[PDB]
Amino acid sequence: GSPTFKCAVKALFDYKAQREDELTFIKSAIIQNVEKQEGGWWRGDYGGKKQLWFPSNYVEEMVNPEGIHRD
Numbered sequence: 001g002s003p004t005f006k007c008a009v010k011a012l013f014d015y016k017a018q019r020e021d022e023l024t025f026i027k028s029a030i031i032q033n034v035e036k037q038e039g040g041w042w043r044g045d046y047g048g049k050k051q052l053w054f055p056s057n058y059v060e061e062m063v064n065p066e067g068i069h070r071d
Contacts, residue, residue, distance in 0.1 A: 003067045006032040008044070013058035022053040034061065 001010055011029040018024040023046045025031065031044035031054060040056035 001028070001064075002030045004030075004032070007034045007061065008032045009034055009042070009054075009059045009061050010063075011054065011059050013055075015054065015058060017052075019049065019052075023047065023049060025054065031059070034059075 002008075008030050011025050011027050011031070014024075014026045015022065016024040023029075025046050029046060031042070031046045033051065034042050034044040036042050036056050042054045042056055042059055043051045044054070045051055046054075
């Protein structure tokens with residue numbers, strides 16, 4: 001996928017906001033700088049946006065450990 005620094009995730013479910021403070025990110029989307037907020041909602045940039053929202057019912061903080069370093 002896209003293993004990179006920062007705490008990211010890999011949307012397993014599909015959303016449909018596109019830009020409502022939440023995004024229409026689709027399954028496989030990768031968001032960065034994440035952290036569930038009092039309610040079960042996550043933040044983090046995805047696209048030209050920066051820290052919108054994604055369910056803790058839809059996303060999952062990378063259920064695949066491991067990771068390599070570029071150059």
